[PDB]
Design a protein around this nucleic acid. Sequence first.
RNA 1: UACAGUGAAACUGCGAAGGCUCAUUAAAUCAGUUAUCGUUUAUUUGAUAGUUCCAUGGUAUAACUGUGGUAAUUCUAGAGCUAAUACAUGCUAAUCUCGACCCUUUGGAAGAGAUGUAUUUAUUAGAUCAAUGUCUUCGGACUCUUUGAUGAAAUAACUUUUCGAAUCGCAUGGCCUUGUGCUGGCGAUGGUUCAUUCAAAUUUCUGCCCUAUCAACUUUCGAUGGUAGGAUAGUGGCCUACCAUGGUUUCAACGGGUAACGGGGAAUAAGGGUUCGAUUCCGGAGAGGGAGCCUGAGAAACGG
Lengths: 134, 166, 123, 229, 591
Amino acid sequence: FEDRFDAREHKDRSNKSRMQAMEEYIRESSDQPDWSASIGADIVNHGRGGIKSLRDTEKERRVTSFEEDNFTRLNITNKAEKRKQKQRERNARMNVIGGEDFGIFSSKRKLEDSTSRRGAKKTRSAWDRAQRRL
Amino acid sequence: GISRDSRHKRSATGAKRAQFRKKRKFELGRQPANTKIGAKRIHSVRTRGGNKKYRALRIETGNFSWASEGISKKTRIAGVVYHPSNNELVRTNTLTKAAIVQIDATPFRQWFEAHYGQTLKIESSVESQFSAGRLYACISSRPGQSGRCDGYILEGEELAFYLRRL
Amino acid sequence: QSERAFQKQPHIRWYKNAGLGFKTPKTAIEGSYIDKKCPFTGLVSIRGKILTGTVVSTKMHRTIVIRRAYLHYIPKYNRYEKRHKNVPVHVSPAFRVQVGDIVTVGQCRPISKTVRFNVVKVS
Amino acid sequence: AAPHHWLLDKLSGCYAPRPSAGPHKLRESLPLIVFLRNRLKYALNGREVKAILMQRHVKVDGKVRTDTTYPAGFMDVITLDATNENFRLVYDVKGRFAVHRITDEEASYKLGKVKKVQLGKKGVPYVVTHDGRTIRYPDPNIKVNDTVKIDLASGKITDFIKFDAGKLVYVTGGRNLGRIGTIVHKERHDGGFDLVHIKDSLDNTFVTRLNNVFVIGEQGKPYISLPKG
Amino acid sequence: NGSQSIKAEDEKVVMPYVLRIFFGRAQVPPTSGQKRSRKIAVISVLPNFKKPYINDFLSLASERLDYNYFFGNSHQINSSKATLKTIRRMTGFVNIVNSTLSVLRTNFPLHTNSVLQPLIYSIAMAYYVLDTESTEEVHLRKMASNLRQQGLKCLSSVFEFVGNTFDWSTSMEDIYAVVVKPRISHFSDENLQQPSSLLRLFLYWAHNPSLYQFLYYDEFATATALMDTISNQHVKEAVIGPIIEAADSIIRNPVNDDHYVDLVTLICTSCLKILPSLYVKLSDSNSISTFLNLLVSITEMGFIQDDHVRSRLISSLISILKGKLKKLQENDTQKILKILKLIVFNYNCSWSDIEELYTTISSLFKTFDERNLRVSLTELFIELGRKVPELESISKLVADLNSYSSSRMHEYDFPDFINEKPNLNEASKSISMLKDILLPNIRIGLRDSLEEVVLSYMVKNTKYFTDFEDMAILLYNGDEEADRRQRAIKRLGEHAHQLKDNSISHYLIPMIEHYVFSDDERYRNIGNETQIAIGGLAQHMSWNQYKALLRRYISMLKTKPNQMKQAVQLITLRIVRDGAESKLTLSKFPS
RNA sequence: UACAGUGAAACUGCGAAGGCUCAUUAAAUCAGUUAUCGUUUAUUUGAUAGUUCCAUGGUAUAACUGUGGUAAUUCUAGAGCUAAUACAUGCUAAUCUCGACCCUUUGGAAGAGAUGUAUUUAUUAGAUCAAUGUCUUCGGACUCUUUGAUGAAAUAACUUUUCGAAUCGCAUGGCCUUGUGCUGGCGAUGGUUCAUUCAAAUUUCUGCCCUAUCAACUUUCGAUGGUAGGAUAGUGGCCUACCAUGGUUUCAACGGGUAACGGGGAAUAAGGGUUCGAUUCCGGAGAGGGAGCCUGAGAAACGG
């Protein structure tokens, strides 16, 4: 019919097909090193936390880099923290053993049905599959 | 009037079960203040900020134009004979738009005698009324929105155009 | 062509070119018609967007009820349901429209309660 | 609540500033608070951004115009005196607000899409732009969606860049806020899906709306510079 | 209080005549000075006194515009306004050059004269001034320097007052007193006299009948000066004739023509000046042109010569008799000039009008045979009548055809001036063949056949009124001459005229093939008929534009083929309009 | 010894500029979108004011004083003055063109036409020619050819008619009219109109329930349309006279629901919680209850 602007139609979602299994394989077979920390500085409340998860240290890198990039300490906004921080530490202490999370193997999410088996370039003709192979 | 909206009266499909809303400001369905004959008295109604609006009630000084020369001169008002947007309008003899009212036309007469000299190119169906004095004239400006009595005299075609009807 | 009262006269006979792909007939340019609400002269102004379609009913004067079927590849039942629409439209003396008779019209200046369109071109 | 064009990160606060009345629109403007504060970061917060707007360093549209929610929209030539920060701001390929740095040469001018030419009163020729540049006495061939060039010291239309076939286009609208290249086709309808279509690196073809579009220059020579990468 | 003053002057008319005259006498006596100025001149005034008479004139002008029926006219008010004009003249003239109060008093003088002349405009044949001598004396003392001073396209103080004095019968006492027409004719016969000179001549024409009808010998001498002014400013009425009113010049020439006809030079100039409306432009009116032609003949019957005036009237007769409009009215004027040019060739023009124009019977059909048996050698009016009967006319069609064939034989009998007349016959025959003519285009083709007497054999093959095998033979004969810009354009336009897209028969596609094949055979000539192919392909573009899109499309598609063959044989040119034509077709493509 | 710093009570400029409870509204709520030359628009922003006849305009009234009434309120009665950016009356240079004449370059004197805005009435300005060429007569009649252009608000009046600076600052500054004689360079606010922004209301289109034991509906708040009047911010059957018998639907009209405390992309997404999980609004009102008025760029006012 007619044209409508849509940020959700050209927005970086990029989280509907990130799976820790695939990213773990890519990190194993990347042949570029991965910027691990010094081995003590990653555990948190003298051990009373976990070590900390990989999602946790990338989010923490983002928070401190945003901190050092526009000069602002965050807050104690209570509705937000009373949901997300207590739920974050509770799923961390249920699933994350030794700094590695194991909830990805005990949760239903189909790996092939969002991450592999490409959708646009599905090659729905034999001519297309022969050309794209060769 | 009360409002100006397609909610309380039905659409072309005749739907039911209205219970729509309680009426707001912008449907200010004002009272019609019909102008009549008297001495000039107007109401300056207030709307939409500093929007004054003159509702004419007893204006008499008719500004009517000789149409074949476009001369807007200043006369009186006698009475309507035809306005069937309501059949009560000719009976009660109000004053509104598109009304043909009779006028003693001595300013038009003296403008003719001041540009011409001779007393009485033009229709005899207006020459008998120049001999008379009382002419027919249609008001086009809105007494309820502009607040004056401005119109055009009838000369020939428009005179007979209202005369064959009545 | 003078049936109703109150000095049927033009408004300032006077004529105008509607244009924009809509040719005005010469009889409507200089004829005897009052040309009160045609898009060619009228007093209205044409604007907005244009629609196309055949008609069904032209029983009242200055009413043209235009039928509009449009196609849409519906993926719900994976099939098509046939579209139909209706809306009255004012006259303009170009070709007197009976049952059928595709017309294109354009958005303009509300006249009665359900019309914003007035005929410009017939085929 | 906060719009996509300003690149407001969600780590901002709670309330987003509604930009006030001015030259530009609501959806097609970023105010000077979100410009200086968290886009190129010359102030840290509201207190010191009002402090620099009361210190009055800015010369957007060649005037000071001291207010935080002053809607400095598309291609309002920002000029800041301390180390000659000269910025003409455009859209990028995803709808946001890019800020292309210019010099004083390019900062001595700008353009404007015309929106109507009317004969209002006293027979005076008439042209208004997106930023309301009511400028006097052009050639009479200022067509619809044409482009004038603003002197930024005076107001006078010094150059005139026509909306017609074979000119480099801009688009502010559709699903395509801000693409460049303008040559596959001119498909002109009479009010809807009516446009000059745009290319790509593989020369694709796109559909936009007519008043959501203006002309920036010519294909192979725009003097109004574009960034790279 | 300005709008209150407008109201005052508006409702100052509900009083009576006695009240109006008493109010006017009260208004006059505030600034009268009548003990000091109503004899000769004003004795003393100040800025304050010159403003009181200025506002007296201001109220006088507003009262004139309000009551322009009588204005309460009075001798005391006239003497007071004369005193005001004389006081303003004295102050502005002998006051030294400071220009401020002098400029105020010079504005007050023009506006005060406007307050005076409005009485002469609105109270013209009601005032009947018998006391005009003193005011006319002061008027000559004011406008004695107005020779060309009040002469321009918009200077209208003395111009308007002199027009008010001139455009009546009995107002000319001040014209016959000393001088009016002197200033009027000076302003008319100025060297660069501007577009009010037509109105100055209009006032002189409106005053000339007054100077005729008045019982004074001074008015008779004024009419003598009127004839002398019309004969002295004859180029003013030509240099100021850029407007549509040539009927006014015709009606001033006829009135002066019924007044007097003086000399051979006057007859020469008047013949050339009424002839200018037949030999300068075509945008004159119907009765204007007929009256100008009859007045040119009425001066030629007055004082014309034998050779030059005969040449002017003979060129007029040759133009207007082959024009022949206005239902024999302009032809009647042409016949009057034809008999009145007074020569042997004029006698031949009179005979060729007399035998042929006897009122819509077989009279022209008898005169065609009479001229074919007794054709003369003046032949201007005869060729005019033999081209006018050759035109889109009803009667004497084949008679005009036979007249043209004997005319070509007479061209071969005289053989170079009668071959120079054939150039005019050719340039008129192309103009008749490029039209909607049926009998006249076929007779023009018969004139082509008689002038070309294989070509004439193919012409006799084509002229058979069958036009399927005949048009195929025309295509085959054109191809035989293939295996001439205007001549090939004439043959192609004759093909397109006999096949002019008229949808009432078939084989129009083969007829278009014939026309485009003749165009291509001319298009092989790349050095001479290149402009012919250019005009023909541009006309095919214009026919693809002008409301016909099914014939001229194939015509342009065939027109491009000789272009592509000539470009293939080229293997520079004007490709600018070619890219324009490609762009025009691309404009038509998506539309 | 006509004003002088704190300073109890008043007006002004501004402020409160956005929140409880109850019955259950199915693309009519709501969203996206076109338009408004159909329209109201404070504010922001851009432009944009020439009609003067024989040294600066009058009282009414607060605060202030004084006498009192009442059980008594931001309840009141007489009497007295006093000034306003309060009422309301009146003071204000000669400047724009066509240029008879020229004396040649420093070129402009004579005559003539002049000069705003707002409210509503009427005629109206809004078919020509120039070349690169048909004929070249090495001259021209030239728009049918090749293109190119002004182009298919000026006038005659109404009206209890608005104003042409009583705002402030930076700057002693110029010229001898023998003194504030002429002041004069500059900036913001003024101020009519138009545009723009924002906002408001109407407007075409687009958007997941079952639906025929809901098949006929709509003239029983006019049903559908014209013409005209009213009034509206205006168009508009939005109300009124007269006139036509309309208009929709089986291609699903109109009509009946819950998990319409749940839904409509309304939207944050959270790197694994696979419909839990972030947010806009349930519908519309009410300030004891209906009724009637007023205020304002915006109100049928949360506070008249």
